[PDB]
Ligand binder design. Sequence first.
Ligand SMILES: NC(=O)c1ccc[n+]([C@@H]2O[C@H](COP(=O)([O-])OP(=O)(O)OC[C@H]3O[C@@H](n4cnc5c(N)ncnc54)[C@H](OP(=O)(O)O)[C@@H]3O)[C@@H](O)[C@H]2O)c1
Ligand SMILES: NC(=O)c1ccc[n+]([C@@H]2O[C@H](COP(=O)([O-])OP(=O)(O)OC[C@H]3O[C@@H](n4cnc5c(N)ncnc54)[C@H](OP(=O)(O)O)[C@@H]3O)[C@@H](O)[C@H]2O)c1
Ligand SMILES: CCc1nc(N)nc(N)c1OCCCOc1ccc(-c2c(N)nc(N)nc2CC)cc1
Ligand SMILES: CCc1nc(N)nc(N)c1OCCCOc1ccc(-c2c(N)nc(N)nc2CC)cc1
Ligand SMILES: O=c1ccn([C@H]2C[C@H](O)[C@@H](COP(=O)(O)O)O2)c(=O)[nH]1
Ligand SMILES: O=c1ccn([C@H]2C[C@H](O)[C@@H](COP(=O)(O)O)O2)c(=O)[nH]1
Lengths: 547, 547
Amino acid sequence: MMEQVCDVFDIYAICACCKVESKNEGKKNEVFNNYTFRGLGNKGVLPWKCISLDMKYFRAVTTYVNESKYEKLKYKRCKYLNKETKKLQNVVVMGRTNWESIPKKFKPLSNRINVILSRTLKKEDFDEDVYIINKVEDLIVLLGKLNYYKCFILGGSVVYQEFLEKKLIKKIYFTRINSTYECDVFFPEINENEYQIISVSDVYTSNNTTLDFIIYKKTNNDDEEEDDFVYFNFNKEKEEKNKNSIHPNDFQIYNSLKYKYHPEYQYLNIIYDIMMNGNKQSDRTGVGVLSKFGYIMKFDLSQYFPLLTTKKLFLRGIIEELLWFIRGETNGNTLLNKNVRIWEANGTREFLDNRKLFHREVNDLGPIYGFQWRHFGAEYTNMYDNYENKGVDQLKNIINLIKNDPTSRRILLCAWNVKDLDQMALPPCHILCQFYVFDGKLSCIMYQRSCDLGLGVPFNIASYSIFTHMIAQVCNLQPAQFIHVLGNAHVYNNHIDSLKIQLNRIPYPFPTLKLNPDIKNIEDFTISDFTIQNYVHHEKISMDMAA
Amino acid sequence: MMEQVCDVFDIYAICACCKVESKNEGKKNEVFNNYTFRGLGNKGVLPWKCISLDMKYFRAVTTYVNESKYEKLKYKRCKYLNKETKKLQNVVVMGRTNWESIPKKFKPLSNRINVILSRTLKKEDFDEDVYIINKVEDLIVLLGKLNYYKCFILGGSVVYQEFLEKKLIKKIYFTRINSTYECDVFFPEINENEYQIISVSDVYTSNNTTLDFIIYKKTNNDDEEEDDFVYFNFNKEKEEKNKNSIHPNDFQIYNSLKYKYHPEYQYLNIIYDIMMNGNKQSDRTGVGVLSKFGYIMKFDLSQYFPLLTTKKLFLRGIIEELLWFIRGETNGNTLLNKNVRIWEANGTREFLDNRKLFHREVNDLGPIYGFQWRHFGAEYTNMYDNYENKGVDQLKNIINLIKNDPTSRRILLCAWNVKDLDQMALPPCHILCQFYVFDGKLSCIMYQRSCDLGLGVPFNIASYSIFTHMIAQVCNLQPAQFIHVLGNAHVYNNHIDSLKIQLNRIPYPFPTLKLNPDIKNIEDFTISDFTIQNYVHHEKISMDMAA
Ligand SMILES: NC(=O)c1ccc[n+]([C@@H]2O[C@H](COP(=O)([O-])OP(=O)(O)OC[C@H]3O[C@@H](n4cnc5c(N)ncnc54)[C@H](OP(=O)(O)O)[C@@H]3O)[C@@H](O)[C@H]2O)c1
Ligand SMILES: NC(=O)c1ccc[n+]([C@@H]2O[C@H](COP(=O)([O-])OP(=O)(O)OC[C@H]3O[C@@H](n4cnc5c(N)ncnc54)[C@H](OP(=O)(O)O)[C@@H]3O)[C@@H](O)[C@H]2O)c1
Ligand SMILES: CCc1nc(N)nc(N)c1OCCCOc1ccc(-c2c(N)nc(N)nc2CC)cc1
Ligand SMILES: CCc1nc(N)nc(N)c1OCCCOc1ccc(-c2c(N)nc(N)nc2CC)cc1
Ligand SMILES: O=c1ccn([C@H]2C[C@H](O)[C@@H](COP(=O)(O)O)O2)c(=O)[nH]1
Ligand SMILES: O=c1ccn([C@H]2C[C@H](O)[C@@H](COP(=O)(O)O)O2)c(=O)[nH]1
C-alpha cells in the first residue's frame, strides 16, 4: 500500500449513460443490472438531443470548489512529491474527439483547467491558457505543478477505459439516463469487486426522460453545539427490542449507503423501521406480523411513476381492477374472465361462509369499493341488480368539485361505509382519498387503514398513482403528489427473508406512465390507454419463498 | 480585545428549577414568564424527592468528555496564558452548603474533579480528594493548572448568583421542573439582554412531574462526503413562494434557536412551513388562506398532555363537546345551557337556511359526529327523537374490539357519512380515528380533512388527546401516541400577524391530564372527572384583530 495516486490527486470520473438499443431480441424477457446503463455516444455527438438537468449537474460538480478544505489538500499534495508551486479551479480531463465536438463559443469550459489526451496535437494550435498531455503519466506530472481543487475525467470511452484499467479513479459520478437511443460507444463494464455504489440521488424528469445520479467508490480486498447534541440524546436507547429478530449483517448493502435519496427508500425505510422497531403481534390470518402505526409517504408524480424497481411488478391486473371500480361493479367474475385473480380468494364459497354471507353467490363481493364510489347509501341486493341513479355517486361528485370548485376542502372519495361493512366480502383497506388543486395541479391523499408492506403496498402505491393521473387528465390538470398515509403498517412473518433480500437491492431510476390524451371522461378509459415506459427492475421475488 | 474568561476555560452553569408556592391568592389569573422556574432548594436540601431523569441528565452532562476536542482546548488556554504546549475529566464547582447537602456515598462526585468554595472550612477539614478555594479568582488560577475538559458550576444560589454577577457563565444548562414546591432558595433573575435561550428539549415525565431542559447562551453588549452533499443539492432554488411579505425579522427569535425538540414545534414548524412555502388560495369563505397538503404530528401521551403553551387555551368547552358527542346528541341547546358556544354560529336560522335546511329547528345540527358515532345508517328525523338501537353504534363496537380483539386492524370510528353530509349543519372535519393496541398501550390516529391552523388545530389536538385517554382508561390500557394527520392544512390570512407573534414565543413544559380512575364505562364521564395540572402558558392571543 502506497497512499493512493487518485486519492492524493483527487481523480474522479464523471459520465452520463443511457440504455442501448439491441433490438429486437424481446422486451418482456429482460434481465436488468448496473451494466444496463452503458451508452456514451453515437457518431460524434451524445446519443440524446439535449438533457438540461444533467448538463446543470455536470456544470456544478466540475465548477465547485471549497476554498477552506484546499489548504488541507495542498499540504497533503506537496508532502507526497516534495515540491512547491485569483480564484481556485478544478481540473477537467478529456480526449481529443471529446474536445473537438464542443462549440467554439463554449470552449474552453468556464472556470476549469482543461487538460486533453491526444498523441497528435501540439500547444501552438491553442493560443489560450489551455494545456495538452500525451500519456497516462503526463497528467500526474501536470497536476503536481498546478494549483487546483479536484480532477474530473470527462471521457469518452477510451479515456474512461484506461483510467479504470490502471486504477486511477477513486469515485465515479454516474448519471443514469432512463431511455433508449442508438449508440456505438459504451462506458466500460464496471467491475463488482473494485467499485460499489455508495449514494443514489432523487429521481427527475428532464426533457422526456427520467434519470438519477449515483456515485461509485473504490474498495479494498462551533464545537459546543456538537456537545449540546450529545446532551439532548442522554435518554436514548442503547439497543432496540427486535434483536432476537435481526443479525448485524442482514442489511449490509442497505446500511453501506451514505445518501439514499431515491423515493423508493421512502418505502424501504418504512420496512427497515418495522423490522428493527416493530411490534410482535398476532393478526386475523394467524401468520403474525411485525407492526407499527402511522407513516406518510409522498411521491412526486410530475417527476416519475413510483413503480417499485427492487422487485418485478406487473400492472394489467391492478388497472383492470381500477376500471372495474369506476364501472360501479361488484361482480368477481368480470375480473376472473380477464385472468385478474386479485379478488378470487375473497369470493369463494368457503370465504363468503366465514363472513356469514351464507346467501351470497360465489364472487358476489357485496357493496365494496365500486359500489360505494358510485352508489353510497343504496340498498345492496346482488351483483346483477340495476343500481343506475341509486345512492350517492361520489366519483361524479369529486370530479364536478375538482373542475368547478378547486379550492373546496370537501373533495373526498370514501369507501368506508359503516352501514355496509358486514355485507362486504371484506371491509376496505383504502379508506379514502382526498384531492387538492393549486396552480393547475392535482394532488391526492390516500388513507390506508391496513397495509401489507411485503405484498399489498407496492400495488397500492401504483394503483392510486394511476388513479391520480386519470382524475387529473379528465379535469384538465397536471398530476402533482400522491400522498400515502399508512395506518396499521405491517410486515408478515413469512415475508422477512424476502424483505432481507429486497432491502439490500439498489433502486433503478423510475419508469413513467403514459395515458391516451384523447380520453376526456373517467368512464371512457380502457386497458390499452395505459403504457408503462422505461420500466427497469430487479428480478422477481416470491414473497413467501417455497410456494 | 483580550477574550472572555468563561470562553477560555469553558465555564457553564447547570441547575434544576421548580415553581414556587405563592399561596393565599387564587391561581385563576396567573402571569407566567422565565422567572416562573426559579426554585432551587428548601431547608438546605432539594425541594423534591428524586426526579431521576434530571439526575441522569446532570450526570451525563457533567461527566461527558471529548478527547479529540481537548487538543484544541489545551492550545487555546495556553495561548491565553502565554504558555507552551488518568482519563480526561470535567471540573465541577460547588458551594459549601451544596457540598454538605450531598450524601456521603456520593462524595466526591464520581469521574469529576471536585472544587468547593468556602471561607469557614479549610483543606485539613476534608478527608476527600477535593480542591478547596476561598475566592472565585482562585478557581481561575486553578483552572490554568489543571488538565480538564469543561467546568460546571453546580450551585447553590449564592455560588450561582456571584458567578452570574461577576459574569463568568457562558452557557446555563437549565432544567425546568413543571411542578410547585416549598422553597427558601432561588436561582437568580436571568436578564434577557445578557442571556437568551438557544435550545429547548423534548418534554418528559419523571416521578409524577413533566420537565424539560433548556440552554441559555451568553449574548454580547472522512470529510470527503460533504462535497457529495453539495452535488446532490445542485437543483435547489434561490427563493421561497412569498419572501418579501415575510420579512427576515418576522421570525428572528424562532430562527435564533439551534435545537427545537419540544413537541410543540411539530405544530409551530407546520405554520412556519405554510407561511414560507404555502399556497395562495381562496376558500369557501372570502378570507383566503395559505395552504399545504398532508402532514403528520405525533404526541407521546405517556410523557405529557400536548396543550399548546405558546398561547392560552381552556378545555371546559371541548370536554363538554366530547361528552355531548359520546351521548349521541345533535341538540345545540345542550352546549349553550353550559355556556359553550362552539356550535352556536352553525345552529342559527340564517346559517341553517343558507344550507337549505328550511325545515330544521334552530340549533338542530342534524346527523353530525354524535349521531354517527352511535347511529350510523339510521334515518335522522329531529334532535328530540329516540334513536335507541337504530343504526350502527360505532363507539360500542370500537370499545368492544379494543377489549376482545386488540390486534384487529379494523378498529376505526368514521364520522364521514356520505349519505348524510347534506343534512348535517356542516360536513365533519375530523373524518376518522383509528386505534392500535400493543403491550397494554393504546395509540390513536385522527385524520383531519380541513385544518384551521390558527384556531382549530390547537383545540383538535386537545380533544383527541383527551379522547385517547378516555378510551384507554375504559379499556384498561395506558395511552401511548396521539397521531394527527392533516389534509388541507391552512393558515387563514387574518391570522398571520398573530401567528408571527406566537411563533417567536418559546414553549414551556407541557401539563398533564388527570382522569378520575373510578370511571369504567365511556358513558360515565362528567366535566368534573377531568383535571389539567401544571398548565404554564404565554398570554392569550386574539387570532383575528377585527373582533
Ligand atoms: N458521455 C460521454 O462520456 C461523452 C461525452 C462527449 C462525447 N461522447 C461521445 O463519445 C465519443 C468520445 O469517446 P471516444 O473514446 O470514442 O473518443 P475520445 O476518448 O474523446 O478520444 C479518443 C482519441 O483520443 C486519443 N487518445 C485516447 N487515449 C489516449 C491516451 N492515453 N494518450 C493520448 N491520446 C489518447 C486517440 O487519438 P488522437 O490522438 O488521434 O485523438 C483517440 O482517437 C465521441 O465521438 C462522442 O460522440 C461521449
Ligand atoms: N436544584 C438545584 O439545581 C440546586 C443546585 C444547587 C444547590 N441546591 C440547593 O441549595 C442549597 C445550597 O444553596 P446556598 O446558596 O444556601 O449555599 P451554597 O451557594 O451551596 O454555598 C454557600 C456557601 O459556600 C461558601 N461560599 C460561597 N461563595 C463563596 C466565595 N466566593 N468565597 C468563599 N466561600 C464561598 C460560603 O461558605 P462558608 O459559610 O463556609 O464560608 C457559603 O456559606 C443546597 O443545600 C441544595 O440542596 C439546589
Ligand atoms: C454534459 C454531459 C455529461 N454528463 C455527465 N454526468 N458527465 C459527463 N462527463 C458529461 O459530459 C461528457 C463530456 C463533456 O462533453 C460535452 C460536450 C459538449 C457540451 C456542450 C454542448 N453539447 N452544447 C453546448 N451548447 N455547450 C456545451 C458545453 C457546456 C457539453 C459537454
Ligand atoms: C441533581 C439536581 C441538579 N440538576 C441539574 N440540572 N443541575 C444541578 N446543579 C443539580 O444539582 C446538582 C448539585 C446539587 O447537589 C446535590 C446534592 C445531592 C445529590 C445526590 C442526592 N441527593 N442523592 C443521590 N442519590 N445522589 C446525589 C448525587 C448525584 C446530588 C447533587
Ligand atoms: O389493497 C390491499 C388490500 C389488503 N391488504 C392487506 C392488509 C391486511 O394484511 C389484509 C387485510 O386484512 P385486515 O386488515 O382486513 O385484517 O390485506 C393490503 O395491504 N392492501
Ligand atoms: O374542529 C374543527 C372544525 C372546523 N375546522 C375548520 C377548518 C376550516 O377552516 C373550517 C371548515 O370549513 P370547510 O373545510 O368545511 O370548508 O373550519 C377545524 O380546523 N377544526
